[PDB]
Amino acid sequence: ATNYIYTPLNQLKGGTIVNVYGVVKFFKPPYLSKGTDYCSVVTIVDQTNVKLTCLLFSGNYEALPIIYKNGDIVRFHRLKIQVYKKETQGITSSGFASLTFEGTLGAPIIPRTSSKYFNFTTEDHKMVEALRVWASTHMSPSTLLKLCDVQPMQYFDLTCQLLGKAEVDGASFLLKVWDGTRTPFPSWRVLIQVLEGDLSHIHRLQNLTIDILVYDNHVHVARSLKVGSFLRIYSLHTKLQSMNSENQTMLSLEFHLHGGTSYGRGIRVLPESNSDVDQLKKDLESANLTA
Incomplete structure (x- = not known):
């Protein structure tokens, strides 16, 4: 059976690979780093009000989170948690995958991803809606x-x-x-x-x-x-x-x-x-x- 468990951002521990949901507070769109892979930085937050900065690397531009603006909601699978300079940070792990959604209440719930195959349940809808409700009061709308x-x-x-x-x-x-x-x-x-x-x-x-x-x-x-x-x-x-x-x-x-x-x-x-x-x-x- 397939059973995905999502860990709250305030219960994260170094040296572990997890799955997380969050609202995007800040992000650097994918860019070709001085290394092998493209890079994207994403700082997410959830109901625990704890922020988590994620460093994501990939050989393919599209394999990175398809985020268009702050407030977007993301689901990350296979995210490794580690400590860098006493500070906890998320980083891509093998098989990393993400789904991105609009973060405004009542907005359509259409998962955005480059993955050909991916899990998507009613539990995900509930998670997205839950984050939209939280963000509606803890964040500012989107304004162009x-x-x-x-x-x-x-x-x-x-x-x-x-x-x-x-x-x-x-x-x-x-x-x-x-x-x-x-x-x-x-x-x-x-x-x-x-x-x-x-x-x-x-x-x-x-x-x-x-x-x-x-x-x-x-x-x-x-x-x-x-x-x-x-x-x-x-x-x-x-x-x-x-x-x-x-x-x-x-x-x-x-x-x-x-x-x-x-x-x-x-x-x-x-x-x-x-x-x-x-x-x-x-x-x-x-x-x-x-x-």
């Missing part, structure tokens, strides 16, 4: 910032559609994206020599598109993106520039995806099965009719 509401200098997660790509200087790469709304100040424009995508469409959209410069480790990822796909760019940084390189006063909003993975800086492609994409498509349609 449009470009028209970005502030002069802040970090934020942007849901958008990719319209163009362009090499710059190897250390950085350009992504031209849009979400159907206009920034409060015109986007800066990186000098391009190269740009792949619908040039006429881009030109017709004018300031509806913005220029995003990604650096270092983010470059190869940006280079592989398919024009026209939908993306979530985590911890994108806006910076209002009031002085150009020639010492002239002006106003332009820059968008930078800085090197490193701190605070989840990264990019995840959103499938058309994502609810946030359905909403985005309608905004794009509306903006397109007027442009």
Whole structure:
């Protein structure tokens, strides 16, 4: 018989492999580490109010938890528990598997995973609903910032559609994206020599598109993106520039995806099965009719 036991986050012990359920408080989307496998960091919490940071490694990008935003609920199978610098941490073990669900009350319960075969019972539904109830009061809803509401200098997660790509200087790469709304100040424009995508469409959209410069480790990822796909760019940084390189006063909003993975800086492609994409498509349609 198949009997999966889930251990509360406050009853975890080092030197053991377990199964856990939790709400995502923080996460770094999958990224190619300096090693062999892709890496993803996920900090989860449950009713015990105890936090657990998990370091997940895999040779396949999709084998890692398919998390799209904080608040998502995950189920982890074959998670090893160990101590690192007196601090308990979770790490991938052989056969590691995960299921991810939306974390909002009343939301559809559709398990997301790359696994071809996986257990899913009424006990899982109960577990998910139980975490949604808990989170509804111990966490904040999900809230999607449009470009028209970005502030002069802040970090934020942007849901958008990719319209163009362009090499710059190897250390950085350009992504031209849009979400159907206009920034409060015109986007800066990186000098391009190269740009792949619908040039006429881009030109017709004018300031509806913005220029995003990604650096270092983010470059190869940006280079592989398919024009026209939908993306979530985590911890994108806006910076209002009031002085150009020639010492002239002006106003332009820059968008930078800085090197490193701190605070989840990264990019995840959103499938058309994502609810946030359905909403985005309608905004794009509306903006397109007027442009």
